[PDB]
Amino acid sequence: MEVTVPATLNVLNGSDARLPCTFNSCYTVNHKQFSLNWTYQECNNCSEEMFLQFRMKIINLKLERFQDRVEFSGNPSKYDVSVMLRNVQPEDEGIYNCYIMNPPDRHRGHGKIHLQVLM
Amino acid sequence: GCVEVDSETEAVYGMTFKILCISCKRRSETNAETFTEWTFRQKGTEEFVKILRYENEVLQLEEDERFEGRVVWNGSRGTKDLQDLSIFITNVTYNHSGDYECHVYRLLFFENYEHNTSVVKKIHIEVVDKANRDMASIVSEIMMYVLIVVLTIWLVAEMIYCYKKIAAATETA
Amino acid sequence: GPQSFVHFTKQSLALIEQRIAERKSKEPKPSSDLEAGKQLPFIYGDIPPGMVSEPLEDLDPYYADKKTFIVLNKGKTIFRFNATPALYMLSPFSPLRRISIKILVHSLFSMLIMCTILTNCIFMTMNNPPDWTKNVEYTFTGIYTFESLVKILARGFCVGEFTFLRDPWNWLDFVVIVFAYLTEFVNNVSALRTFRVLRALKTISVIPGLKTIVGALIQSVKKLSDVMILTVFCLSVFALIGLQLFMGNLKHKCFRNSLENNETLESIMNTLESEEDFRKYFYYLEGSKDALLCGFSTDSGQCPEGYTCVKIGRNPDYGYTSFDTFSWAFLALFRLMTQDYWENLYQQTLRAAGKTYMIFFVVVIFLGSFYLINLILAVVAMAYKEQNQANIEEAKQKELEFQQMLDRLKKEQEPYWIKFKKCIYFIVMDPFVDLAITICIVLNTLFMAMEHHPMTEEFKNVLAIGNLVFTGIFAAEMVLKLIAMDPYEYFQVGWNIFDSLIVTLSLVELFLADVEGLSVLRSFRLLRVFKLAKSWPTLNMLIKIIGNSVGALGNLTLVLAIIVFIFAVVGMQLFGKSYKECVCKINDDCTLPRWHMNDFFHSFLIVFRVLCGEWIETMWDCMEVAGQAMCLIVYMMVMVIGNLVVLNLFLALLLSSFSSDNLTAIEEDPDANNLQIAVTRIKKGINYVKQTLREFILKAFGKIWWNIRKTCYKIVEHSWFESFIVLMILLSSGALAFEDIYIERKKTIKIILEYADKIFTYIFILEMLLKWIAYGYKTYFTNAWCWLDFLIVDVSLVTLVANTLGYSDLGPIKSLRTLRALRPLRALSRFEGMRVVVNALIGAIPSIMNVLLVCLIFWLIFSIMGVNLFAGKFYECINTTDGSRFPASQVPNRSECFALMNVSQNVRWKNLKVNFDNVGLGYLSLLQVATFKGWTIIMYAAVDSVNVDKQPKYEYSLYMYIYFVVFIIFGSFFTLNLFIGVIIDNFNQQKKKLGGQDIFMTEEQKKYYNAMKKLGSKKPQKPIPRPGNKIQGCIFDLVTNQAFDISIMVLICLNMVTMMVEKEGQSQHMTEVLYWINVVFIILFTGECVLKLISLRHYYFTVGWNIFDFVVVIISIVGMFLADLIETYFVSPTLFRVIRLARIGRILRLVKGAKGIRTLLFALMMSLPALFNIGLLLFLVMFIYAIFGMSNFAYVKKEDGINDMFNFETFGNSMICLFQITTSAGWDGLLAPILNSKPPDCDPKKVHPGSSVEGDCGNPSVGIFYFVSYIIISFLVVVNMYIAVILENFSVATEESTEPLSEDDFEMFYEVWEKFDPDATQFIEFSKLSDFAAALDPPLLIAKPNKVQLIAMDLPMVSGDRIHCLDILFAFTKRVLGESGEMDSLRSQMEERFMSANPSKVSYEPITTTLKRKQEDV
Ligand SMILES: CC(C)CCC[C@@H](C)[C@H]1CC[C@H]2[C@@H]3CC=C4C[C@@H](OC(=O)CCC(=O)O)CC[C@]4(C)[C@H]3CC[C@]12C
Ligand SMILES: CC(C)CCC[C@@H](C)[C@H]1CC[C@H]2[C@@H]3CC=C4C[C@@H](OC(=O)CCC(=O)O)CC[C@]4(C)[C@H]3CC[C@]12C
Ligand SMILES: CC(C)CCC[C@@H](C)[C@H]1CC[C@H]2[C@@H]3CC=C4C[C@@H](OC(=O)CCC(=O)O)CC[C@]4(C)[C@H]3CC[C@]12C
Ligand SMILES: *[C@@H]1O[C@H](CO)[C@@H](O[C@@H]2O[C@H](CO)[C@@H](O)[C@H](O)[C@H]2NC(C)=O)[C@H](O)[C@H]1NC(C)=O
């Protein structure tokens, strides 16, 4: 599955960071079966923390590390699964992953963004 | 192919008679479970009293001494999707003159849906003493004889005309 | 100059330079026969061995001045070049350039490239090649780079005129080389690999003869411009009609009434998206993927109770079948034009909108589909015939030029074994032995045919011994001839090779314990009847056709093939992966469908299917998996190009063969036909035996009657009598339309008809009696029509007598009653139109029967092969609930199927009900395959076949598709060619017999036809006089300017584009905008009308086009007013749309300017009468078949094709179904439910409430005869005849450049005659002929030298070297007028008017002619 994300995303501290993610799946998005997991790891060999998941509807896990700054910013039926991180902080630097399953499409999609926080 | 025909309105005394009540379905392929009642009021009264109920495949008859016996189901056989509810009287008496009713209750079956439906058919029966030939038949036969005769006469006339003229022209040459 | 060969030298190069320079300072077409690429003229003789393949100086004088040099091969092939330094680097003498030119024109080099192309093509077809193949790809591109280089190193890049880039064909491989090196360094990877397929195209520029063929195809296309414009125009007009009538109709669905949770339609339609969801609210009919349609009218489809019709959701077929926008309507109408699965659109539309609209489809199919397709055929045939007449003219005239140049060269030159071999060779008697072996082989075949599926062991072994004795006789006759001839002698006739191969295969299959599919060759042995000489002319016709297909027109076949290959590989490259991936869209089990493009073979199958006329269904799936656009583009290209090449090949074969047999000459066989010799021998023998047996038997042993006859003869020929009889016929026939399944409801009419039948019978019996009395038996019973009427009245009288007597219902009498359907036949002898068409059809029946017989033998071969391959292999163990073939993992063979029946319930081991179990069903299945209707199901069962009683597996064979492809190619392509061909060659002999007159028009219609052809004249009338009132004169000089008409045309086009922009549920704002724009356009054109009507005061009604414009103005205004009036006062949607239909008239004015479309439409108008007569006959036949259907198939089960609507129950439904299958669409669907006749398929004890008939099974024999006969009659009439009609009217129309006119200037001929014939003897000397022709004025003037033309006119000569005056007069008038038909008509009058004035015949005897006399002199 083709998943389009910026490999590196550079955002100023305090600004809003939209993490763009779209995916080219031919099959129509069935909200009763579509699956999205947005995870976060500090390093390639570090632990992933799921922070948002589309299971039937948008589930925001409200991880303490993000406070209430995570928002969904996509539209699954339009093949957009982007998220928004409001008022970015230096600790938000790291790796963010968009996982995508669009049954009955066989292949799972994976986008990986390296978010860097500028002064 | 179900075809809704309608019954006759005159029965001959002392004989047997088959009342019609045919209630087709809109789409033949659907499944149904039909059961039917009949009601009748003898001419000279205003009260439709039940007489028979045909359910499953067994006919149930009320105790109306007008129809104690003398009646037999003659609709559809062993189908549970009746689509034809005609009954058959035997030994027609004079008490069988009145208005008959044929209630059809049909439960249609669909994917996730069941729609009970109802249809009522009304019939008016008059018992006579001798079978009267229908006016249409007599009129048609009379018109047939008349047409045959008038065409024959036209031809004969034309022939005699052309024949006398042809004999004249024959003798001229 | 046979010895003009000179090595291109430096000194000669300098010479050429200085020569061209001097000529230019001081300051013709090249000889096309010396043009490069051709062959060297033999007049130059052999080439010196030191001169071949070397730079030589230019031979053609036209290039002798220009800077060039020619090189020739060892095959006398001319190769021009440019002597300028290639890339200003190499001289024509440089060693590099020298060897470059050496190798470029070398035989090995040319062949090398062909083999490379072919092997690369083979490599292209692997969907997922292994890795190492990259090295081979590098090899390919390296070879291509090398060959391109060696060519640039010879001809240069662009530095000259004869240079690489000059030939367009080099551009292809050039951009291929470019891609070859862009694609590896710089990087949609599935769209780049396809581009390398142009290497496949490269074969066209190497195989000798393909450039010519593609040029011929291009020239054929360039003439199809106006037809394509007209096609677009008609499709657009009909598409606007459909958009007006059906917009948003196909969205109707049966929505359930009772909803829970207080929900509405909207709250639901946005919350569910899945098949299993939409199945909970709308009604889907058991196994369909779309919801059932419905309608608000009374003649539309119904919804069950608890379901209401409502307009919501998507259209059917994923959304690709609709009249919503203009593009979808255009697609649907293009689909209607080619008749691809049209019947499905037909049924869907009629269900939604009601049966009446049938009229729309009727007109589109006849006026649109049939007419435009035949127009295409006619134009392609005309272009081909023109170019091929030109080509045969060039070939023959250049052969005569070769004879002339050859003549010019000629004038310039001026023991016991041997005697035993000869004792056996005695029995090689052609009229005996050959006949004998031909007879046995026919028997053998018949014996093989007796093969069928369920066989007793006896029959099997009997057949086996038979194939033993036949093998023995064949081998025995083989070796005898083998020794009486010996190899050199034996192996020269093709048929000896045939029989040798046959006996070899026979014996090798004799010994072999194992069984092989060589049975096919066994069956082929039947071809031996081809060895029966021309005596059977049509079999020779077929074999000659096939020969031309692989012979003369071989290059075309090869081109079709390449094209199919290219399209298959490009489809495989573009769409394969998509089919594999997004598969779960077009299938419910995420498995590839039966037709896909994932590998080369299936892709080729899809391309082949498209060419066979089915393109829409695969396209839908492709559009679903790939994008709409790309898919459309690919299939539209395939459709148009492939069908064009198919039509070209078809017409080439047809025309070539038949017009050549028209042109061929004496072909008496070298050997008297053995048959013929023998038949004379056997006829002489049987006559001798007749005579000997006759001899043996003889030696062993008053006025009133004539008055009556005259009178009744005066009766039956009066006009009143015939009119009354025709009225009775119409009434009696119409009375049959009322006996349907609902006659029981309408009792009165039932009795009325029952009684009127007797009146009709009485009238017709009286008529027959009068016929007898007036004509007598000898005059009567020798007529066909009277015989027909007699038979009909006989069956009616028998039905009557039996009935009245009282034993009615006595079996066969009830069946005989159904023959009442023949009563309409009494109308054929009354209407002159039907009479002429029927006459023509009867006149053609012989030839039809011969070609039919030829086809039956050829199809017999394929039927026997199919019986060998597929006998009894179509059984399958299915789940009757949902019709699923069990998986075959369980239930592997028939035994297990029965076990499951024991255990389970709804399983059933059923056959296919049309199969190859024997030769009859073989013939039926082959007909279904040859008409492409019904084939799919037969083929799938075939490719899944495993063995006799084993469960079929999904594509276990997969290659019997080859069998069906071959059978199509032969039995459906070639046989249709031969069929169409003989019926058009015969329709020309009928035409010739009656003096070249239309054989489909009666007298009144011939008169109307001539008067209407007199409309395509060019008589220019005076333009309207300019009025004097300047206030009108300005308007006049304005309205007649050409700019005015141009502006009006662009206004009409804008109006069209405005009508196009409408669509389903557009808006309110857009609706109002469009309304006001329409108002403005109405005002504008009204304005033009008024202005015309103030300038052309009373001349505006002298043009029919202006009358049409006036009419459309009136209609448009009335339509607008009445539409708004209805919209206010009342409410009626259907009526509102029907009345808005009127605004289309403003569009029809576009044809006024297109000077090419008017011609084609004039041709259609010319052809209207013949089409009317044919339509009458077709309607009569349709009527008869309807009545039988209603009689027979009124109660059959509802399986497929027979549904709630579209049944044979009433007259309307029967006529609808018959009109459908008139185009043979879906006739298998109608036939299928008739073929079942035993439980559990049907029930012979069905009840049918409201009727006394029992059972729902039809009679298979009756149904088969019914449908086969009907589609054959339709093919005989509506196709062939229609085509013939149009193929002649089109010719007639496109002849418009006609009228030849001149006046009697003959007095000047006589004024000159007196000065040379002073005594007025009407004769002059031959010597004086040379100056008399030089003293006349034009056009009879003959300038010096008159002698060469005067002798070619072969004037007759009287004794004394004298010529008559009428001879030279007729000779000169012929020279100006030509060889016209009136030229011989006038001469008959000119010679007769002289014979009446000069009875002295003695002085006119011609002794010689001028052409003979000059041959006596020389
Ligand atoms: C001249 C007659 C006798 C034969 C004509 C054959 C063509 C119709 C075939 C051969 C090459 C094929 C083309 C090969 C390449 C393309 C490009 C393709 O578009 C893309 O691949 C886009 C890729 C991207 O955008 O990344 C569309 C199909 C098309 C036009 C094919 C259309 C069908 C073509 C033109
Ligand atoms: C018994 C009564 C009530 C009715 C008698 C009717 C016959 C007089 C009709 C019916 C069949 C007709 C016959 C059909 C066939 C022929 C053969 C025909 O001769 C040929 O066709 C020769 C053909 C040839 O030589 O190639 C002459 C007319 C004739 C006798 C017809 C004469 C009139 C016939 C006998
Ligand atoms: C009653 C059923 C069971 C059998 C019906 C058989 C008929 C259909 C056959 C037998 C006699 C045949 C007829 C014999 C004679 C003729 C006359 C023939 O016309 C001519 O010969 C004209 C000759 C001329 O004009 O010089 C046309 C065929 C026809 C009607 C034949 C048509 C077919 C017929 C009527
Ligand atoms: C279809 O309709 C019939 C008639 O309206 C229903 O029969 C009634 O059943 C109720 C009990 O549910 C009784 O109280 C009535 O007296 C019955 N009416 C008569 C006269 O039959 C029938 O149950 C309905 N069928 C279904 C499946 O709902």
Ligand SMILES: *[C@@H]1O[C@H](CO)[C@@H](O[C@@H]2O[C@H](CO)[C@@H](O)[C@H](O)[C@H]2NC(C)=O)[C@H](O)[C@H]1NC(C)=O
């Ligand atoms: C014939 O087909 C029907 C329907 O597809 C089968 O019935 C299904 O059986 C499965 C169990 O294998 C159940 O889970 C489904 O609910 C059933 N559906 C229906 C509509 O009944 C049936 O088993 C098949 N027959 C055989 C012999 O396999």
Ligand SMILES: NC1=N[C@H](O)[C@H]2[C@H]3O[C@]4(O)O[C@@H]([C@@H](O)[C@@]2(N1)[C@@H]4O)[C@]3(O)CO
């Ligand atoms: N262009 C087509 N014309 C045929 O009428 C159609 C019928 O026959 C066929 O074999 O399958 C179905 C459909 O695909 C057909 N396609 C195939 O020919 C069909 O509807 C029922 O079989």
Ligand SMILES: *[C@@H]1O[C@H](CO)[C@@H](O)[C@H](O)[C@H]1NC(C)=O
């Ligand atoms: C109806 O009933 C009568 C009387 O029993 C019987 O004779 C007749 O056969 C039946 N007819 C039908 C249609 O069942």
Ligand SMILES: *[C@@H]1O[C@H](CO)[C@@H](O)[C@H](O)[C@H]1NC(C)=O
């Ligand atoms: C009808 O019933 C009456 C009363 O029993 C009887 O008298 C009469 O004969 C019956 N008629 C027939 C036709 O059965």
Ligand SMILES: *[C@@H]1O[C@H](CO)[C@@H](O)[C@H](O)[C@H]1NC(C)=O
């Ligand atoms: C007929 O009906 C009347 C009542 O209207 C009743 O008195 C009489 O007994 C009935 N006759 C028969 C034979 O049932």
Ligand SMILES: *[C@@H]1O[C@H](CO)[C@@H](O)[C@H](O)[C@H]1NC(C)=O
């Ligand atoms: C369903 O209908 C009831 C009416 O009794 C209403 O009170 C309720 O709000 C409705 N539910 C919805 C979801 O609209």
Ligand SMILES: *[C@@H]1O[C@H](CO)[C@@H](O)[C@H](O)[C@H]1NC(C)=O
């Ligand atoms: C059918 O398949 C079964 C497998 O269980 C096998 O035993 C049997 O022999 C097969 N039938 C035949 C005719 O071989």
Ligand SMILES: *[C@@H]1O[C@H](CO)[C@@H](O)[C@H](O)[C@H]1NC(C)=O
């Ligand atoms: C099953 O089928 C066989 C015949 O093949 C029969 O003999 C046997 O009695 C049947 N048993 C059942 C379970 O009906």
